[PDB]
Write a protein that binds this ligand. Structure first.
Ligand SMILES: [C]C1=C([C])[C]=C2C(=[C]1)N([C][C]([O])[C]([O])[C]([O])[C]OP([O])(=O)OP([O])(=O)O[C][C]1O[C](N3[C]=NC4=C3N=[C]N=C4[N])[C]([O])[C]1[O])C1=NC(=O)[N]C(=O)C1=N2[C]([C][C]=O)C1=[C][C]=[C][C]=[C]1
Lengths: 133, 666
């Protein structure tokens, strides 16, 4: 029904190693070459990758910006409203980014902002200019 | 098994069914009702038991009925019929028994039997026992043919048959109770010893053997499932198949390596693409930090757009630091997932050079079993006789097997040194023309009703013929003779003054250096009381070694042995002999095999007798005149003593039935 355990034997494979006198050693050569031609390709890309790693040496350590820890207030200082209007100009609807920039307003206050001051900071215009980029 | 059912089994018969041969002489019973069948079977078995229990004395119709019960000793035509069948076909009272009723005084019919091998002897005994006139014609100056036994001083070793292959269903079992052969069991254990002269260690010994075994099954699967039996018209041999399998095993090893590295690259290149992304981010980062730094250095107070700039760039920078942190994450995974794959490779090779060599010894062992190059055996059929193996441990005939032919020969008309040259057979009888092997111009003629031919297949094969058939054998028979295989295997007998091997070890292998010579002295037997070693020559090697001088052979022989035991534990041999069966003109080989393109069926053709054409045209169809026995004639037990012995019984039966007529068939 099935070959012995760990003996391998396809109908297809048999017809292959018989179809002529040396189809035998022919086929074990195409593999012997297909093999070495990959073992080599490995080293090529192990070498490529080894050098691309030596560029990433040092990490991003000299570029990392210390931890800002600040209490989410609820008042909109004029300064903050101004930061806001510009964060919109630059970021569109990304409420997280705006919130990050302003520093001390949570992702929702920001959404609410969009609705209160909508009239007086022409947030329509501002948003429609952000799109044009 | 045992009881009366043991007897059925120990006689090679199904205890609870009627055989085709029984259906033949009891068509009344077998086409009858199940009830009668059981009575018959019982009678049969019970009789067998009786004979078996005590085969040193004849078992008569009386003495049988004498020992039966109701409802069985009820019908006595039945009992008499049964006993008479069993007797005719040598199931009971065969071999060497004490007769109760000294021999019926005048004989009927006359038979010439060519050759006093065991097959011939066993047949003669039966026919004489059936009161017929029998004479055997032996070319050699001794009985026993391929049962040869070297004797000198206390040295005793067979150059021919040597082992009893299990007593479980073996006619020979009976014979050994009639004849004091000394039967010693053989311990299976066989330590191999590489070319260098040192043990293959348990670790390897086991892996190779086990692979060998798997390799065989593999061919079998290949044959029955994949049906790989013809290859551009020629029948596939076992040898061929073995290669095709090894080839495929080699292939898959490669196949496997290939897709393992194929897995490394696909991953070690997902990694590249990630590192590329990672550089380019570290790039944007470097420059963004600069931008932010320059925007922080504008000391305040600042207007809001310049304050926003600091803020903007600050977020923008942490955003790109989140990313190049999740990528260094990913990077770590793919980098370990790669010490992974790269640490557990698949295997380097299917089999090493030391391996392929040890596997070769296992092939030699098989070439020995079959007396032939695996490239000659039939794929589909080489093992057709496998089912009918006896059960029990193999044995050696410690006092030399010759003791059997000699026992059988006793009482018989045997003309030794008489070489048959022509067999002519006609509607009214046969004459056989033989010569004297010593002065070969000195001629003999034998007249007879029947000729039983037990000539070895090797002989029957000769071109051109050593024995002429007149008229020629029908083509259906000669094709059988061609198609069948007749191989070769040889022995070297080493006689020393002292044991220097392991007394408790019966056989030990030597591993050759090449495929080409796996057979050469590949195996040694410690079997006898005396200090004697036996060395096999099998496979392709056997044939070639026959052209080498005895000394050179005993050369390579001692060489190997020193190699294994120490260059000075191994003395010169006191007496040596070397067999050459392919050379021997009264053998022309050693025993038969199922060659590629043959089948078990050819063996049946061998046994089929020959019936001549009519004398005067339009005269009635004649009686069959020419009959065959021999190891090559018995489908289920080729190549053996017991198998020949059996073919002898067979023919004697069939001959008597024909010539003395069968009273029991009614
Ligand atoms: C060879 C061999 C060896 C070495 C070993 C062995 C064997 C073998 N086997 C087998 C047997 O032996 C056989 O089969 C038998 O014996 C056979 O018989 P037969 O059939 O009978 O035949 P032969 O014997 O041959 O005889 C015949 C006769 O004839 C004559 N001739 C010829 N020609 C002629 C004549 N005459 C006249 N004229 C003419 N022309 C001759 O001479 C003869 O005599 C075996 N078996 C068994 O059983 N056992 C054993 O052991 C054996 N061995 C084996 C192998 C197998 O495989 C073995 C070994 C080891 C282990 C196991 C087994």
């Amino acid at each position: 029904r099935k070959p012995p355990k760990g003996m391998f034997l396809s109908q297809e494979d048999v017809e292959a190693v018989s179809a002529n006198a040396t189809a035998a050693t022919t086929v074990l050569r195409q593999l012997d070459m297909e093999l070495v031609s990959v073992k080599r390709q490995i080293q090529n890309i192990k070498q490529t990758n080894s050098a691309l790693k030596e560029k990433l040496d040092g990490g991003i350590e000299p570029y990392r910006l210390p931890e800002v820890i600040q209490k989410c207030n609820a008042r909109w200082t004029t300064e903050e409203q101004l930061l806001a209007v510009q964060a919109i100009r630059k970021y569109g609807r990304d409420f997280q980014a705006i919130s990050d920039v302003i520093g001390n307003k949570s992702v929702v206050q920001v959404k609410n902002f969009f609705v209160n001051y909508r009239r007086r900071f022409n947030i329509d215009e501002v948003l429609q200019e952000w799109e044009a980029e | 098994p045992s009881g009366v059912e043991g007897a059925a089994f120990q006689s090679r018969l199904p205890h609870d069914r009627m055989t085709s041969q029984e259906a033949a002489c009891f068509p009344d019973i077998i086409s009858g009702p199940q009830q009668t069948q059981k009575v018959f079977l019982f009678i049969r078995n019970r009789t067998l038991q009786l004979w078996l229990d005590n085969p040193k004395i004849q078992l008569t119709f009386e003495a049988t009925l004498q020992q039966l019960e109701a409802p069985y000793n009820s019908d006595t035509v039945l009992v008499h019929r049964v006993h008479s069948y069993l007797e005719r076909h040598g199931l009971i009272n065969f071999g060497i028994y004490k007769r109760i009723k000294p021999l019926p005084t005048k004989k009927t019919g006359k038979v010439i039997i060519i050759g006093s091998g065991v097959s011939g002897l066993a047949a003669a005994r039966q026919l004489q026992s059936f009161g017929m006139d029998v004479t055997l014609l032996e070319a050699r100056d001794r009985v026993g043919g391929r049962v040869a036994t070297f004797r000198k001083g206390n040295y005793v070793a067979d150059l021919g048959a040597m082992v009893v292959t299990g007593l479980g269903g073996n006619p020979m079992a009976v014979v050994s109770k009639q004849v004091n052969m000394e039967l010693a069991k053989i311990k299976q254990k066989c330590p191999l010893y590489e070319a260098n002269g040192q043990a293959v260690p348990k670790e390897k010994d086991e892996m190779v053997e086990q692979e060998f075994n798997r390799l065989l099954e593999a061919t079998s699967y290949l044959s029955h499932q994949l049906d790989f039996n013809v290859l551009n018209n020629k029948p596939v041999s076992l040898g061929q198949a073995l290669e095709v399998v090894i080839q495929l095993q080699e292939k898959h090893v490669k196949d496997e390596q290939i897709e393992h590295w194929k897995k490394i690259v696909k991953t070690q290149e997902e990694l590249k693409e990630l590192l590329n992304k990672m550089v380019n981010l570290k790039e944007k980062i470097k420059e963004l930090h600069q931008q932010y730094k320059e925007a922080s250095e504008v000391k305040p107070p600042r207007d809001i757009t310049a304050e926003f700039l600091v803020k903007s760039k600050h977020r923008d920078l942490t955003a790109l630091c989140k990313e190049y942190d999740e990528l260094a994450e990913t990077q770590g995974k793919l980098e370990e997932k790669l010490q992974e794959l790269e640490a557990n490779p698949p295997s380097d090779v299917y089999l090493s050079s030391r391996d392929r060599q040890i596997l070769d010894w296992h092939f030699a062992n098989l070439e020995f079993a079959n007396a032939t190059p695996l490239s000659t055996l039939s794929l589909k059929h080489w093992d057709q006789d496998d089912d009918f193996e006896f059960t029990g441990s193999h044995l050696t005939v410690r006092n030399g097997y010759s003791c059997v032919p000699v026992a059988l020969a006793e009482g018989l008309d045997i003309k030794l040194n008489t070489a048959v040259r022509q067999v002519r057979y006609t509607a009214s009888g046969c004459e056989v023309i033989a010569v004297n092997t010593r002065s070969t111009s000195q001629t003999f003629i034998y007249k007879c009703d029947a000729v039983l031919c037990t000539l070895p297949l090797g002989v029957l094969k000769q071109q051109p013929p050593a024995v002429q058939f007149v008229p020629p054998l029908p083509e259906w028979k000669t094709s059988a003779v061609q198609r069948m295989g007749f191989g070769n295997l040889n022995k070297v007998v080493l006689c020393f003054d002292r044991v220097f091997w392991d007394p408790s070890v019966n056989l030990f292998g030597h591993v050759g250096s090449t495929t080409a010579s796996r057979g050469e002295l590949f195996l040694f037997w410690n079997l006898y009381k005396a200090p004697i070693l036996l060395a096999l020559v099998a496979g392709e090697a056997a044939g070639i070694m026959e052209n080498i001088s005895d000394d050179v052979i005993v050369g390579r022989c001692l060489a190997i042995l020193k190699g294994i035991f120490g260059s000075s534990a191994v003395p010169q041999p006191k007496e040596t002999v070397v067999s050459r069966w392919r050379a021997d003109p009264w053998a022309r080989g050693s025993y038969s095999y199922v060659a590629a393109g043959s089948s078990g069926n050819d063996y049946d053709l061998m046994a089929q007798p020959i019936t001549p054409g009519p004398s005067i045209p339009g005269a009635p169809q004649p009686i069959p005149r020419l009959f065959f026995a021999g190891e090559h004639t018995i489908r289920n037990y080729p190549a053996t003593v017991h198998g020949a012995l059996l073919s002898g019984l067979r023919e004697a039966g069939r001959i008597a039935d024909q010539f003395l007529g069968a009273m029991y068939t009614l």
